[PDB]
Design a protein around this ligand. Structure first.
Ligand SMILES: O=C(Cc1cccc(C(=O)O)c1)Nc1nnc(N[C@@H]2CCN(c3cccnn3)C2)s1
Ligand SMILES: O=C(Cc1cccc(C(=O)O)c1)Nc1nnc(N[C@@H]2CCN(c3cccnn3)C2)s1
Lengths: 393, 402, 401, 391
């Protein structure tokens, strides 16, 4: 298997740089956690002789990681021609870049891609930290369903868009918040997680869960955003008191403590790069693609994607489901967390928002992405007219 | 050569293949001997008529060799079809025990149907077929026709024109009491007001008899020429008790929701006719499979609908297709479906198969009790939910795999 | 007594002096209750311009009760001349407000000059005053809604009528919903409620007889002044009545009609009732019948039961001015009903009826000049439902010397 | 002279004091009436037989009021016959024993006419909290001090219609009216702005004392503590209004909520509350003191909104059948105004499903079935009703 792969890259010896170039062109990064042993071995070899790899040295280096390297080089990844795909991503990025309207809650614009096989691409401002805000709502819902199951969670929150052209009603007709993607629903979801412990431990628990979803890439916290959310959270206090009065919380809930935790969760920071990996975990059935670790149950992921599909883009949710047909979640910092199930996760970020509250550039990019590729939920992988299918050669 | 390869597969060391042995093997892939794409092969077999040498076999199968090769090399979307239909039969028998609900009675033609009629038909995107129960009994599409006529409208007129007159979203728990959204358009094509507007868009400028003929011809193609009929007795009854639909018609007219030059009372007549179109589970499953197969009819290979028409139809069936149960159905079942008052549920598994489930008794939401029960069990068993993962699906079975 | 009254007006009374004094009370010489007196005066000017004690007694004796109340300043508004002078000033002030749009949805409405403006007053004692265009016929339209509701309650009682229609404003939900939560039209003053009310009247006879019955009832309310019919308005209403057909089918589906109703026949009758014509003068008498507990003030006949009148006034108060109803109830505080021809039927209970008419409508559908006049009227006089009769700051109380 | 005329009406040489007192009470006035203070002081100084001269000395300072009383010029001339009807209505409502006390057999009705004629039956001297019955009173204070235009920049003027009171704000982002909780909360924020809550409360208490002609007004600290501990719905309203900028600039919203709970906890008796209602019936003048308490504008606006908005979700039915401005509260009080005639307070703790006192609702319907008091009854033609304004 090491030999087979040796011949593919070879003709007596392989220069190390040639192996690295070929590896990167598959879309994997040399820092990928699943390539740690291989890359450690290569570094050790460049020490123990001072740039050329025979059959035997090669086998020694790649043997621990041979399954993944074989899939990579045999073009078995979900997107086999990754270089051609990222060239299209860059063109969509540049086209969205020209849409400069909208209002910040301005010129920063980044897009990151992580496939379900861990292939990575970034364009623009993808290493700048920003708060998740409402992008965290699907993530904490997934955690709640993961730990508690669908039946328990949906005793407290509903499963459908309100329809009302406003977040204006807090409760559906059964006295539950409409869904986990609206503020009242996210507040109730927050109350379900890790009940019985203090806020510091609840927060640590959620942070550890997000670290795993992001394959240990950047997850941080903006104390400045937290302070500001809590000082202008009058609408959220209104929701909290309303839910308390209507008995919407689990028995023994400290409602004002839950609101504080809620503001903390909104203030969690990511980059486009780290958030794309979180989205890829959702695209990959709850397994983190760059570590192989099982993070969320399949039930948690399926429910989260269903509700992002119908409820994730504020009052634009219905239009977005129809035209784009992908589970997505927007936030006021300008983030759009986007999932292409079975294919990839993305995070798009540009601060200026349209009248609906959605990033202008991200919305434009999402429409162009589905115009180009047969990724709409109800596109037919068989016949798709003029679209490109990046899953094929 | 391809015919020879296939000859050896069926021959298994023998010099000649008995005809019955070829037919049995063919049926076990899921294809029917009547499949329109196997016409030349079956014609040749009839001309030959009970033993087939290499040469005679090649003469018979040569015109249809591509399809027969895919069949016998287990390349169909569901390779182990026999095992799959065994699961379908178990789900069928389990739903059969759920005999609650009430048959619709508001007209004599609905009230007449036995509560105990129950059929399920499957047609995969490769034309593999299976039926259990009462699958050859005609019943009216009723609201099951709504996605089909919307697909026709989008096919002929494009998304932009159609959605100038009808919206694209569920109204939400505002029930179905409001006829128009805030932009004075019916909320979507799956509610009565939206379907009435859609009906006014089709084949404009010709009389109702020609509009109806056109729609009937279109449904014939979607069904691969299987049973499509018309119930004049249902039509007469719909039209005499259609007070709610007349209220909608006058309301839309007042709010100028129709294309210029519309004869609103004539459109209502056409609407009642379309609701009275009859299918069987068998023929409707093929229509659903056309939608699962990106607009190509799987048992004919004919392009019937544009990709845009099919995608838009499936999107709206997903969110709007099961009356007030639409949101719950989208969440738990996660498949585009459309129910009707005759007890039909038209069900699409994109890229995999179409189905029609039919049982007259309806739940409190208006949906077939047995069909709803079957749809839940189907997705509990198989990784067919829209947001199931194709790689990691816990203990579900994936019928696309060996 | 005739003698007492003789001395009040008096050795001999010139006829012209008796007539001018009579007119200054606000009564008209044509008042039906003065017929015998005026007949006797005309006969006297034929036989034998001067009236001694004896001739006077012969003339006024048949009508002496009414003439005594008139001359002893016992009418509801004793200084009527001073009151009508205020009415005229309010009229002239509203005349300057010439904004709004004439209704155009049918040719018969679109036709009316924006500048037509009339106000007529009829007190509960039959005192009359008109200013401006008060003898021009126009269709009641929605102004007929309280009148046919009153007829229904008169003939059938409150409990029967309110089995089919509700008793409350829908709330600023506007009038997009045809039915309340109990599947009844919200009240008799909205189109769906008026359609159901129409189905209750004179059931079991044909439309021609239903119409004749309503017309005879309106004639009595108007003390036999002008009540007519605009066939041209009727034809136009019926050919563009799409919204009303929508309501009719909706009500039929929801079983809102009395058993055996011919819904399309009811719609036809509904359009006929909307096309009934009045003048400001004749409609003010209809409003005065409602102000006077169901007795027509110029004939003394009782047109409607006390129950019918009370219920009609209650619903005009809360539901009568379309989406402006709540604002109108708060600021003006009088039962009123508007219509798309520019009419405002206005009732001051225990005091008077009025009809204000000016075609140009505001954005709510109410006559701009009529609305302006109604506000000024209550700013000036202590007529608001919740003004006090004893302590009213700087308002004038016309029912007081 | 007026004292002499009155002397003759009450053909002896001398009037026993008891005979003057019993005749006075039969007009409906009480001997403690503040407007009869000088007369009753003089009688006490005199103390049992009164000649022409002594009588004149006693009644002279109050002679105008005593003349109206004895000449049957009061709004209800045959008061004794009227109170006999009130007692029958009282006994008939007494038999309606359903409903649930807010989480019991007490029943009182008090009448005060616009002329200060008084009658009570049942439990009319037991203190209970106004609760929502305070809403029209504080709205009247706000309009009195600030005018209609300013107040209605912050609160609307109409019933919401909506199934219940599920929406806090109308389409213009104002609470629908002053009689719903959100509207009363905004009204509370308008009163005596810029001073602390203790002074705002003192000011309102002084205003209520005048409306009640100085009869019983108290405060239930126990009710206040309970309202604030379970006021989650009111905190939701407060935060919602704050977010939508519904309060005057510089408002301390949590302080306003505290004041709101205090105002709900003010105590009255049926007797003292009937006088407050009579102030509203009498154009803003307190009938038993003659003092001007509220502007005519404040009173008219208050009565208009009580008419359409005062009886929770029963308001539209009540307006149609009863046709009188009224305001109910969760302690079982119904404050009722018959404009130009009288105020009443009905109190019985058990409430119907709408939140209204069962006995009070029954009494209000019977009162208008009997008498031509509906706002759209006619004063000349009224079928078989009794008109208590006539002899
Ligand atoms: O109708 C129901 C379901 C429900 C909620 C509570 C009780 C029931 C029941 O009757 O069982 C039903 N939902 C509701 N959700 N939220 C409501 N009110 C909140 C606070 C006030 N508000 C608005 C919005 C716009 C304008 N003004 N105020 C939104 S009402
Ligand atoms: O006002 C909007 C626009 C719109 C659309 C979606 C939501 C809203 C909203 O209420 O916020 C408004 N649309 C409407 N569509 N249909 C309406 N009325 C029809 C006939 C009468 N009717 C009913 C229903 C129940 C009871 N009574 N009559 C249905 S009015």
């Amino acid at each position: 298997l090491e030999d087979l792969l040796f011949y593919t890259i070879a003709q007596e010896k392989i220069p190390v740089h040639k192996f690295i170039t070929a590896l990167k062109s598959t879309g994997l990064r040399t820092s990928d956690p699943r390539l740690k042993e291989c890359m450690d071995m290569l570094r050790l070899t460049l020490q123990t002789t001072s740039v050329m790899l025979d059959k035997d040295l090669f086998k020694k280096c790649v043997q621990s990681n041979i399954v993944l390297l074989t899939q990579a080089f045999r073009r078995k990844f979900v997107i086999p021609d990754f270089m051609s795909f990222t060239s299209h991503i860059d063109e969509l990025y540049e086209s969205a870049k020209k849409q400069s309207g909208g209002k910040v809650a301005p010129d920063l614009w980044g897009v990151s891609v992580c496939t379900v096989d861990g292939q990575r691409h970034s364009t623009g401002d993808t290493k700048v930290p920003f708060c998740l805000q409402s992008c965290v709502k699907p993530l904490k819902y997934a955690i709640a369903v993961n730990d508690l199951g669908t039946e328990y969670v949906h005793r407290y929150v509903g499963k459908e868009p309100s329809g009302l052209r406003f977040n204006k009603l807090f409760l559906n007709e059964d006295d539950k918040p409409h869904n986990p993607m609206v503020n009242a629903g996210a507040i109730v979801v927050t109350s379900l997680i890790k009940q019985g412990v203090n806020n510091a431990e609840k927060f640590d628990y959620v942070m550890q869960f997000l670290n795993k979803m992001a394959g240990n890439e950047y997850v941080g916290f903006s104390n400045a955003t937290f302070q500001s959310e809590r000082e202008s959270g009058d609408r959220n206090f209104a929701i909290g008191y309303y839910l308390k009065e209507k008995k919407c919380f689990p028995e023994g809930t400290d409602m004002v403590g839950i609101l504080d935790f809620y503001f903390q969760l909104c203030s969690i920071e990511v980059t486009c790069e780290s958030a794309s990996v979180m989205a890829a975990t959702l695209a990959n059935g709850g397994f983190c693609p760059i570590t192989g670790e099982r993070v969320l149950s399949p039930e948690a992921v399926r429910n989260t994607l269903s509700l992002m599909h119908s409820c994730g883009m504020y009052d634009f949710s219905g239009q977005f489901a129809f035209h784009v047909g992908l589970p997505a979640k927007s936030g006021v910092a300008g983030g759009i967390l986007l999932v292409v199930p079975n294919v990839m996760g993305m995070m798009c970020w540009s601060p200026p928002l349209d009248k609906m509250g959605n990033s202008v550039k991200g919305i434009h990019f999402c429409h162009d992405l589905v115009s180009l590729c047969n990724f709409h939920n109800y596109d037919n992988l068989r016949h798709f007219a003029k679209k490109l299918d990046p899953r094929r050669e």
